[PDB]
Design a protein around this ligand. Structure first.
Ligand SMILES: *[C@@H]1O[C@H](CO)[C@@H](O)[C@H](O)[C@H]1NC(C)=O
Ligand SMILES: *[C@@H]1O[C@H](CO)[C@@H](O)[C@H](O)[C@H]1NC(C)=O
Lengths: 158, 418
């Protein structure tokens, strides 16, 4: 149609997806051969130095998405913000539930939820206790998930 | 041999059905059956004795010798095999003749190779197009390193230097987690978690065959022992919701659960071929255990939440085991027998997935029965247990679109499948 961008494979696509950053047409034609003066990339398509347009999700990811490195050439300050009392602030400023803290689980990418947990040999009030294993969440006590190696959870769950 | 490949050898010398190894009944009068499946000392010590030190037992101590132990009447001899230089009378370090071992691991995106001592860490290959490397495997004789990329849905091979990157599979491998390389038969064993199947291909991807898919729910680890013709893999969530670390012949003929106790999330599997043991890490329960090839003498190497919070992959070499942990995002290092504190061999910002030790000893040479004119097979010659197939040790399997003929060596076109 008039508002549908034709593609090399024969499929059609709305002209919005043309240079939007993602190849909505499965032949990549909507993003292929774009970035020129006539081929104005969309706002969602973060253009790099050599007309290298990448999705806005790739604005400042750790991955060097484009060879020019404009995704990594400049990056703004993060959003520190804050978290609730129940939430735990991980080093990457991610709010994390207390039960997810110290559970031998990389629940928040940086892993600070589990950083320096051996200092205490007991368990949290909201976390059940698997002596041989860990301080699993109290929800696991009777959830059918024998998280405790000893099977301390799922005991007396009538 | 008198005892069959799919049978457990009693001390008396009688073969026992493989599922009976830890069935729960002492089928072996010698009590060899059910010999300490559960995971729960000294010499000069005189138990209730003034000076009568306990005789204990020669070469019966977990960790007495890094390798085969020669039992002496009042002492022990820590014998070391070929290519292994004895050290301190208790450790079997490698022979300097072979080059230094290399710990090939994935930081989370790129594939890194470093010296076993950890002095330097160069990048063997960087995954492109936003891809990430997950599993690693190598063929030392050909100096090739194989790694899978789940994001790119491709499997790549490269030279040890970091050149001549080749693409072996990119058709249907959407999420290949781990790999195992049969150096003896030049076969690659692949674990595909997208459709929960285990496929075996040549080093060039010439022939593809799916081997084990009866009840795979979430395969996570794989390991092959070409010398004995075995195949070990782990599933952390089967179809029946039952994790099943399983031993099977290389062709997946006699499937048999290996560990049936305290198996939370069996993630990684590695084989100590010298001591004939299976080392598997559990991400859920937080423990790296060790049982024999028959799953008999279960030993807990490292346990505890803090020490090993969330292991994914483990590789063994000499008296050291290298296991990667997701929670700590580090390639930790531990003793083969028992370690009270993991050693941080390397740490990465991303979660490491693969780990292997690149060394000649890791892949001992052995005869390949398929060398005899492709084992007489019209198509893929797959090795099996040495005892299997009248002792020939190999089976004929047909690629996709072909069916084994009555002779079991030829391949006719397929007829009917739903
Ligand atoms: C170790 O390698 C050397 C060659 O460098 C060889 O002569 C020797 O037999 C090998 N094994 C032992 C046990 O030294
Ligand atoms: C896989 O890679 C080979 C070699 O580059 C190539 O010839 C083939 O077309 C590729 N197939 C897919 C599915 O990408």
């Amino acid at each position: 149609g008039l508002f549908s961008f034709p593609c090399k494979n024969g499929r059609c696509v709305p002209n919005y997806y043309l240079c939007d950053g993602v190849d909505d047409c499965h032949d990549n034609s909507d993003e292929q051969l774009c970035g020129t003066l006539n081929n104005t990339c969309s706002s969602s398509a973060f253009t790099c130095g050599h007309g290298e347009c990448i999705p806005a999700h790739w604005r400042c990811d750790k991955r060097n998405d484009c060879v020019d490195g404009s995704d990594e050439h400049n990056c703004p300050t993060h959003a520190p913000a804050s978290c609730l009392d129940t939430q735990y602030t991980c080093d990457n400023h991610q709010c994390i539930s207390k039960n997810w803290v110290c559970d031998t689980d990389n629940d928040c990418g940086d892993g600070s939820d589990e950083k320096n947990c051996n200092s205490t040999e007991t368990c949290q009030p909201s976390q059940f206790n698997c002596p041989n294993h860990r301080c699993i969440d109290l929800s696991f006590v009777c959830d059918g998930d024998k998280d405790c190696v000893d099977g301390s959870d799922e005991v007396g769950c009538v | 041999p008198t005892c069959g490949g799919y049978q457990f050898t009693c001390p008396s010398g009688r073969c026992i059905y493989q599922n009976w190894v830890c069935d729960g009944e002492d089928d072996c009068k010698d009590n060899g059956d059910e010999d300490g499946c559960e995971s729960g000392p000294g010499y000069i010590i005189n138990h209730n004795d003034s000076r009568t030190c306990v005789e204990f037992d020669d070469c019966q101590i977990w960790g007495i010798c890094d390798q085969k132990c020669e039992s002496r009447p009042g002492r022990h001899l820590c014998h070391c095999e070929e290519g292994y230089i004895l050290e301190r009378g208790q450790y079997c370090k490698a022979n300097d003749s072979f080059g230094e071992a290399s710990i090939i691991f994935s930081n989370g995106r790129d594939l890194l190779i470093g010296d076993i001592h950890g002095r330097s860490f160069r990048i063997l290959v960087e995954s492109q197009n936003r891809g990430v490397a997950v599993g690693v495997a190598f063929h030392y004789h050909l100096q090739r390193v194989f790694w899978t990329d789940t994001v790119q849905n491709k499997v790549f091979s490269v030279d040890i230097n970091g050149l001549n990157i080749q693409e072996v599979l990119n058709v249907s491998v959407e999420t290949p987690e781990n790999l195992a390389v049969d150096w003896v038969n030049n076969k690659i064993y692949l674990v595909e978690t997208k459709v929960n199947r285990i496929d075996m291909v040549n080093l060039d991807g010439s022939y593809r065959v799916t081997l084990i898919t009866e009840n795979l729910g979430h395969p996570r680890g794989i390991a092959v022992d070409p010398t004995v013709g075995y195949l070990f893999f782990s599933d952390w969530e089967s179809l029946s919701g039952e994790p099943k670390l399983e031993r099977a012949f290389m062709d997946g003929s006699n499937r048999k659960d290996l560990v049936k106790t305290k198996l939370g999330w069996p993630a990684g599997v590695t084989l100590d071929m010298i001591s004939k043991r299976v080392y598997w890490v559990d991400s859920r329960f937080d423990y790296i255990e060790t049982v024999t090839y028959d799953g008999i003498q279960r030993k807990t190497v490292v346990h505890g939440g803090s020490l090993i919070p969330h292991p994914f992959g483990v590789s063994l070499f000499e008296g050291q085991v290298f296991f990667t942990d997701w929670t700590k995002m580090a390639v930790l290092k531990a003793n083969k027998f028992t370690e009270t504190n993991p050693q941080v061999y390397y740490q990465a910002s991303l979660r490491p997935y693969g780990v292997t030790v690149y060394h000649s000893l890791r892949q001992p040479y052995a005869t390949n029965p398929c060398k005899d004119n492709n084992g007489g097979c019209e198509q893929v010659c797959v090795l099996s247990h040495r005892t299997d197939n009248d002792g020939l040790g190999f089976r004929c399997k047909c690629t996709f679109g072909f069916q084994l003929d009555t002779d079991e060596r030829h391949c006719i076109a397929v007829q009917n499948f739903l």
